[PDB]
């Protein structure tokens, strides 16, 4: 018993540092004398069947042009990437969606402004791995305003030879979202349009290295990330010869259930700027007839404010839906919501009061969408969604 | 489809809303003309089979002497509280164990030394709740240290009229724990030892009210709370005199196991403050051979740090560990946990190896106890412990 004391106390300390350590963020500082930035970081790739294999990334970057940047004090971007495939495509390849953040610094440049839209992207990659030499095509788009890039990736000369896990973090960190208060922190977008230099040594623990460079600039109006890429040293059953990393997890919200949360999030953020502020949340919240004061609006923000700018963006606000709920919690959220909807609590969602509720979030719905939204969810064909109804629309 | 499009949106802000409003934190303000404090809140006590009861608190504290108290700006406490059984106590009572820290503003005394280690609590409570009159004692002991109170309460004039999770909230925010840069906001220890009165209006929606007047002072060394509380107007057989409340859940973390994570916590915590600084946590990591920057520490610690004071508090510790895993990231975990015992990777931890970690982590055991825990985990008598011997310590 004591013996097993002993085991429970220490087990917990470590199992708490590796709940610590478990972050993957990407830490900038300032290279002043190369008038750029430097970075490190650790990525963790999982590894078929368990354990993870590191990558220890460390990177510099340095602009292309002779004029000012934008050289910051010490943060780092936080990454939410979701690797998927296309069942269309026939060839070797990689369909990415992003998510990237700035945060760690407490609360119109010419550069920033070329990103405030969607904007295209081409990548270019040629490698070399032992020997081993393969291209990447990829296309598509980022939107800094929430922090997305989505891409889709084609290894145009036959079969990729390493993983695509690996290649994730060499395959345009301008595109991440930087808060007001962290603006002149911005060094990626300060050197746009002639674009900056990005050089990165990923040392594979245990296995060999890759040394990266690219030129990352505007051609015309599409952002370009042209690539060499140099490995060496890799051992040919390791986890990267030998293809032995997971390349995803059946446990991943997909493309269009993270566009239904985007919707949803344009509901608070009216404004498209995107964040939630305190005066938006309770706008709404006041529309469906509830009275935070601006305490509980700032704290219910600070809950999930991961960059403690005082706002939610849709990161942040993807995080907070995207989090799995004990079977139990989930139907007490579900019965909540359905208090929402059944204004007058009487046990029946009526059109009149579906109505009401798409009018108090700011949907746009005509009458007949409404009933629509009824015959969908009605089952027992009184024209109103009970509570077991609704249960079915929400599972 | 495009109607059930509509569905998915909406439901989603609607849950937003709910998850966001989740909270049930204690915001206070300064009361300047009556030389305290005010608070406000809403508790959500769980109705058996579903729904909540919501109980609106109204909150005044003003002291009891006649000289300089602490005015704080807004802030407000966070509490976990875990309500259960003592399986050999007879009468109608509620063990309580309770953690309460301070946050909402951004980064000794007299009456601060009365609460710097553990202190006796008496808790006195005459009730009338329409027209039901009953009595209540508690005692037990708050350690301000770790925002900690563990307590008993008995009914001593029989069954008690109204559910126990209803008088909690009346059941000493003086043993709160606030961070240093807040402590000029902590009126609850500054109005000590003559102490304050409390005084509240509890609103249960659809239903009665509690009226509660609250005496909280030192006599001799130990924090007395003797309480007055008024019911009335409560429906014979609504959640509070019908007894419909959930008195607590299956799941939720027991004394020893939450004992057993203050245990770990002390290891980091070396001298004893409470907090986990990111000096003292670079300390434990560099022992056991890891080497994080700064910038990682800082960012590890943020992650879990709930009051922005860059350091972790026992509670934000418990948080952290309190969490649960899906079961194929526990797997991983206790894979990584392992990798940390067995240094030299081999796939066997060594007695040698077993003593250097404890060693590393600060525990202090002999040569003996080292091999009863080799004893303890050895299932094929090697006198080594394996990874799958390892998985059964852990689990
Ligand atoms: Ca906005
Ligand atoms: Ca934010
Ligand atoms: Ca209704
Ligand atoms: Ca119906
Ligand atoms: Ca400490
Ligand atoms: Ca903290
Ligand atoms: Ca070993
Ligand atoms: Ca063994």
Redesign the interface.
């Known amino acids: 018993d ?20 478990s ?1 993957e ?1 990407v ?1 900038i ?1 300032a290279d002043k004398q190369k008038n750029g930035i430097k970075a ?1 970081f650790k990525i963790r790739h ?1 590894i078929e069947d ?3 294999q590191l990558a220890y990334h460390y990177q510099q970057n340095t602009p292309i042009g002779d004029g000012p940047v934008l050289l910051p004090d ?1 943060h ?1 971007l936080s990454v939410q990437s979701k690797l998927s495939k296309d069942p269309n495509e026939k060839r070797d390849h990689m369909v990415l969606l992003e998510f990237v953040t700035a945060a ?1 610094i ?2 119109v440049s010419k550069g920033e402004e070329l990103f405030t839209g969607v904007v295209p992207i081409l990548v270019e990659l040629d490698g070399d791995v032992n020997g081993h030499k393969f291209s990447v095509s990829g296309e598509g788009e980022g939107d800094a305003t929430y922090g997305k890039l989505t891409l889709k990736f084609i290894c145009t000369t036959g079969k990729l030879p390493v993983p695509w896990p690996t290649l994730v973090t060499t395959l345009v960190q301008c595109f991440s979202r930087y808060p007001d208060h962290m603006k002149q922190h911005d060094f990626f977008k300060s050197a746009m349009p002639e674009g900056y230099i990005q050089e990165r040594t990923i040392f594979f623990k245990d296995d060999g290295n890759y040394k990266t460079r690219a030129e990352v600039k505007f051609e015309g109006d599409t952002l370009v990330n042209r690539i060499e890429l140099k490995g060496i040293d890799f051992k040919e059953d390791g986890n990267i010869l030998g293809h032995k990393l997971e390349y995803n997890t059946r ?1 991943q919200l997909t493309e269009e259930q993270i566009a ?2 985007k ?2 999030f344009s ?2 953020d009216k404004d498209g700027d995107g964040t939630i502020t305190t005066k938006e ?1 309770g706008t ?2 006041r529309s ?1 007839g ?1 009275n ?2 601006e ?2 609006l ?7 404010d991961a960059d ?1 700018d005082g706002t939610i963006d849709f990161p942040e ?1 993807l995080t ?2 995207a ?1 799995k709920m ?1 079977d139990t919690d989930s ?7 359905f208090r ?2 059944d204004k007058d609590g009487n046990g029946y969602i009526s059109a009149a009061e579906l109505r009401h ?2 009018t108090n ?1 700011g ?1 746009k ?1 005509t009458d007949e ?1 409404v009933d ?2 009824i ?3 009605d089952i027992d064909g009184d024209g109103q969604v009970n509570y077991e109804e609704f249960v079915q ?2 599972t």
């Open positions: 004591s013996s097993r004391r002993k085991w429970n106390k220490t087990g917990h300390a470590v199992r708490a540092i590796g709940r610590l350590s972050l963020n830490y500082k490190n999982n368990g354990g993870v010490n780092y760690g407490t609360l446990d239904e949360f919707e949803a509901l608070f949340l709404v919240m469906l509830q935070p004061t305490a509980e700032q704290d219910m923000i600070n809950e999930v403690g606000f907070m839906m989090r004990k139907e007490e959220e579900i019965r909540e919501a929402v909807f509720v798409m979030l949907e719905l969408e629509e939204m015959r969908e969810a629309m929400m």
